[PDB]
């Protein structure tokens, strides 16, 4: 395309021509740098898919390794078996598209566009060497001679073997532009010609039909949810309007009568006068026995029932009582005058 | 699973049951924002690829729209053109995974999740106040009185309302977390294997053909550059050695002699006699014309030739000459006796 050998004339009808050439550049730079980000934003965006895809495989896989205090396990693992051979054709298409689509626009951006502008800059440098050159060697008159033409000759060869090259690249770039263009492209299609094949070798029915299975399981899953769901803010109405005259510790005498022939009393109790501050925790009648729980602590025993009668009396406080079977107990304390009854009445109750 | 009815009592025995429970969730919540996160990555990244494919086949298309100082074009649209039908493959997809995957899960992360927290909070704070409560009324002697018992009535009844919809929060959760699971694997799933179906749809033969054809006629195009780079090395070898003899303005006298019969001379000469700096420019004899043309500058006239001959002389520098057929011209100047000589010569010869 380019005239190789009318470079040392260096006519500037032939300057012109390679203001072309160099226009051309330009805009092909252009388009092609815009290419070059967008295949890049692609392959990026393709790699980054790849690896998610599989690090949820990988944590769908480690259901069965949770802490957690069955159709389910079994299925999340085909679930992971089916999102497994998806991994590998995202990872598959990313390499493909790595070494025949990111690589070839990745060079072509790199050494071929580049070597284009370093060649350019050379011969714009040998070029106004010899310009200076011809100057000085001008203002001569009628050794300094020798000298000022030598630089003609040295800046003048320069100047013939800079822009060669050069024309040499340019017209290289011609065949180059076809190549970094269709080469990268048709790279990206097969690379996913062979993407969508192997995904669909694995997307078959009995995969659909598993598929469909767990549909219904789930929205079988979801009924008995929003159905659990209604007999308890019901329960919790019914339950909320019932309990309401039963949070004041002492209730209604007339509608809550002090049970006196119970063979079983349950609740919390406040323990031993001593100060320097009591203990809170939960009691129960058991087999002859009277168990002790603090808040939380998962069941102890503390005082054996076969005493005979139980006073009472205080330390400050209201509704005490003390047991003194085996040798006696702390001093227990209600929260009511009915708690307190049937305390005192239920344990001597228990014989 | 978790009783409601066992909420009033409020044994230790109960809240360690909802320990378990709470020990679940923190596992639960654990797990499920792992998965959630891979998930959110898998959505990014395909909506990134499919914009990054539409941005690539929007380029291709303005192939034709570039100012660009034929196959091509037409092989940049069908490519543009199955790249076209790609994206939307990806464009369908994401918004499928957005619908039917990413929803799903950040509701459950958003929503469910927290709801847990934000009620397992209410109950810690209903749970302490009763706790505080129950003290100052224990605390009493023997109205301060009314107002220390209204605070049970009241901590109490809060107490037992928050745990409840807790209870219930936790049960519900346990219905969910099958539901929050499963929903948005189905949907990734049922979302990818319409995704290879409409993808292979546009995937046929006549395509692989296309493909398999441009591949050969780049193969062709790489190899015409390949044997166009061959023979322009060594034109710029051969050059190169051919030229070095002719860097230097005067070249050998007897090797190449001034050439006197010349009815064509050209080459860059500088003009007029007025520093205050000459001119460069190349000139070529042209019809009886002396044409000449500055730097890149793209063929302008200055004297007609039909002069008789053509004297010469200076102004203190050398190879110096001067047209006066019209009524005269610019004094000339050339940078060899060589060059000299053939220019007073051509002119001449010109008649």
Same sequence: chains 1, 2.
Avoid at 181 to 196: D, K, T, V
Avoid at 235 to 248: G, K, M, N, R, W
Avoid at 257 to 269: E, F, I, M, Q, S
Wanted: proline content about 3%; hydrophobic content about 35%; glycine content about 2%.
């Amino acid at each position: 395309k380019l005239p190789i050998e009318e470079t040392l004339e260096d006519s500037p009808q032939t300057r012109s021509l390679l203001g072309v050439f160099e226009e051309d550049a330009t805009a092909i730079s252009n388009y092609m740098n815009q290419l070059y980000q967008a295949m890049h934003r692609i392959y990026d965006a393709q790699n980054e898919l790849s690896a998610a895809t599989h690090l949820t495989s990988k944590l769908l896989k480690e259901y069965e390794k949770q802490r957690f205090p069955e159709v389910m396990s079994s299925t999340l693992q085909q679930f992971s078996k089916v999102i497994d051979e998806l991994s590998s054709c995202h990872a598959v298409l990313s390499t493909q598209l790595a070494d025949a689509m990111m690589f070839p626009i990745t060079q072509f951006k790199e050494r071929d566009l580049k070597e284009i502008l370093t060649l350019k800059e050379v011969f714009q440098i040998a070029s106004n060497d010899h310009d200076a050159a011809i100057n000085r060697y001008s203002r001569l008159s009628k050794k300094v001679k020798y000298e000022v033409t030598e630089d003609v000759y040295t800046s003048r060869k320069k100047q013939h073997q800079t822009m060669m090259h050069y024309f040499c690249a340019l017209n290289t770039l011609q065949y180059k532009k076809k190549i970094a263009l269709l080469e990268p492209l048709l790279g990206y299609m097969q690379a996913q010609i062979s993407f969508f094949k192997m995904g669909s070798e694995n997307l078959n029915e009995q995969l659909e039909e598993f598929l469909a299975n767990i549909g219904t399981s789930v929205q079988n899953v979801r009924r008995e949810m929003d159905s659990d769901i209604e007999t308890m803010q019901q329960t919790i109405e019914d339950l909320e309007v019932a309990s309401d005259p039963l949070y004041v510790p002492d209730p209604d005498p007339t509608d809550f009568p002090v049970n006196r022939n119970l063979t079983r009393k349950a609740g919390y109790l406040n323990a031993r006068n001593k100060t320097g501050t009591w203990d809170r925790q939960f009691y129960f009648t058991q087999g002859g026995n009277l168990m002790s729980q603090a808040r939380g602590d998962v069941a102890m025993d503390i005082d054996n029932c076969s005493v005979m009668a139980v006073d009472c009396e205080d330390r400050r406080y209201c509704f005490q009582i003390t047991s003194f079977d085996g040798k006696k107990s702390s001093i227990l304390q209600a929260e009511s005058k009915k708690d307190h009854e049937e305390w005192i009445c239920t344990i001597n109750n228990i014989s």
